[PDB]
Amino acid sequence: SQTVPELVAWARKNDFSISLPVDRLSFLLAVATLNGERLDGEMSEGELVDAFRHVSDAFEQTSETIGVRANNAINDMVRQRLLNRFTIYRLTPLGIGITDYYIRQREFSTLRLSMQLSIVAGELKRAADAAEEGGDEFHWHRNVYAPLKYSVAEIFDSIDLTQRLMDEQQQQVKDDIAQLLNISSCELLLSETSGTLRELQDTLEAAGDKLQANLLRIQDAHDDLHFVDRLVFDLQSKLDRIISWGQQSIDLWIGYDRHV
Amino acid sequence: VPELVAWARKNDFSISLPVDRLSFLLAVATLNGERLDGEMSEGELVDAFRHVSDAFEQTSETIGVRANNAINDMVRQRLLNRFTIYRLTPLGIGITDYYIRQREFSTLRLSMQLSIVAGELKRAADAAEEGGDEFHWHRNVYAPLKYSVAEIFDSIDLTQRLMDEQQQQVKDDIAQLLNKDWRAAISSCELLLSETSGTLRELQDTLEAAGDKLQANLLRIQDATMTHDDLHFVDRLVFDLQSKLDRIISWGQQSIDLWIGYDRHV
Secondary structure, X not given: OOHHHXXXXXXXXXXXXXXEOHHHHHHXXXXXXXOOOOOOOOEOXXXXXXXXXXXXXXXXXXXXXXXXXXXXXXXXXXXOOOEEEXXXXXXXXXXXXXXXXXXXXXXXXXXXXXXXXXXXXXXXXXXHHHHHOOXXXXXXXXXXXXXXXXXXXXXHHHHHHHHHHHHHHHHHHHHHHHHHXXXXXXXXXXXHHHHHHHHHHHXXXXXXXXXXXXXXXXXXXXXXXXXXXXXXXXXXXXXHHHXXXXXXXXXXXXXXXXXX | OOHHHHHHHHHOOOEEEOHHHHHHHHHXXXXXXXXXXXXXXHHHHHHHHHHHHHHOOOOOOOHHHHHHHHHHHHHHHOOEEEOOOEEEOHHHHHHHHHHHOOOOOOHHHHHHHHXXXXXXXXXXXXXXXXXXXXXXXXXXXXXXXXXXXXXXXHHHHHHHHHHXXXXXXXXXXXXXXXXXXXXXXXXXXHHHHHHHHHHHHHHHHHHHHHHHHHHHHHHHHHHHHHOOOOOHHHHHHHHHHHHHHHHHHHHHHHHHHHHHHHHHOO
8 A cells, every 4th residue: 555656656757668669579570589599609780780771671661771770679678678688689577578468379278277286286385395395494495495486386476477378368368259249150159268267267276276285284393493483374365366356357248248 | 491480470369568567467476476365356457557557647547448448458568368367478578587586596496406317308308218109208208308308498498588788787787887987987897897707617517517418318218219119209399308408518619708708808
């Protein structure tokens, strides 16, 4: 409540912003097409300039002013933190996240989820075994704290991520059905989406119980171990949030389904 | 591939996030990360907007309207999904984490990512070699490569780039320190130099320790697809993962060279 104003202060003080008109985005998009398809060397300035030429030509822009304009774009991109200049160029994580969103083929399948669900199961059951038969701070730090902090936490974020890829799909089907209403195909799109949302939560819920117990086991196994307890607390509440959104999305799809 | 440009053009894709809109987006983001029971309602997001309006000395009588506009413009731009209630999209999340989430450059983090990718790669190579049927290929070699190994390579690349900006920042901070007076700030510059030298070396030593064996097993999977032929799609995925891992080790060395370069330069 008083944290989120300090955020604004900070943001305001730092003057953080992104400006990507359609031609700037595309330029950034095309650059990512080389930073993903580039043999092994990193991207030179002449390479960035060449990509600018293409989008420049594509947008009908005056060829005479490229060099000037391309240098301006590249400088904007550095300054807006989407690109790094080394003394050659590399997209920053900001650049990478934004571009990935567009040029990536992030397809959602229940498989992705099941895959991610098992690996964490394994790292979790292991950490739990580790913590049941204790040791020095070195055995705690390495076989129970770290596993939890660096690999459990990270694949809960990956599943969070997979869920959102499913949110993206829902919306697109909505948009797709909204096109077909502007019939029988709409019953198909409605159908198979429910199936997926239903397959999702079954395999989520199924593993969910198992993951939960092993968190519970680890909690049960001391002072000077609170920072392990904290970690476990919000891994739980991260997991529960996922599952809850899991159920949540199925219920409101029924809202959307019978609505047509 | 300038039809991507045609595609971006014909779809009017863009990002328009001025300081006041981004602050709001960051605001929303910190609701999202620090969340008990429930998702994000339109109510929470409006109270979020309030504080950013307050802090930007914006007109208080209009707040309700301008919030609906701001929230609306987030959805349009695809930062946010509205459900009939609000969720940050993949795009929203990436942009947001860039500014907000902690940067952790732990060697041990890396070592465990490498370790679990080693096993996933070993099992997929085992699975391919004795390759059963269509379901077997989809679930046991491809599914781990893309949904698990690809995801970890992304995240290693991602913290290499995080490190890229620690590098440049330091290089900037060192440049300013030795301006006012070179002979005094050397002791501190030597600090900043050697700590980054240390981080970069350690991360690379870990990567190079895993790379040859991750490569071997990626090769095995490629091997087991050429005695078949309906597996172009596993073949292509192996080829990308091979390319990516090589970019990462290679860029790893480039950074060191560049840093040793900068060290010499002072």
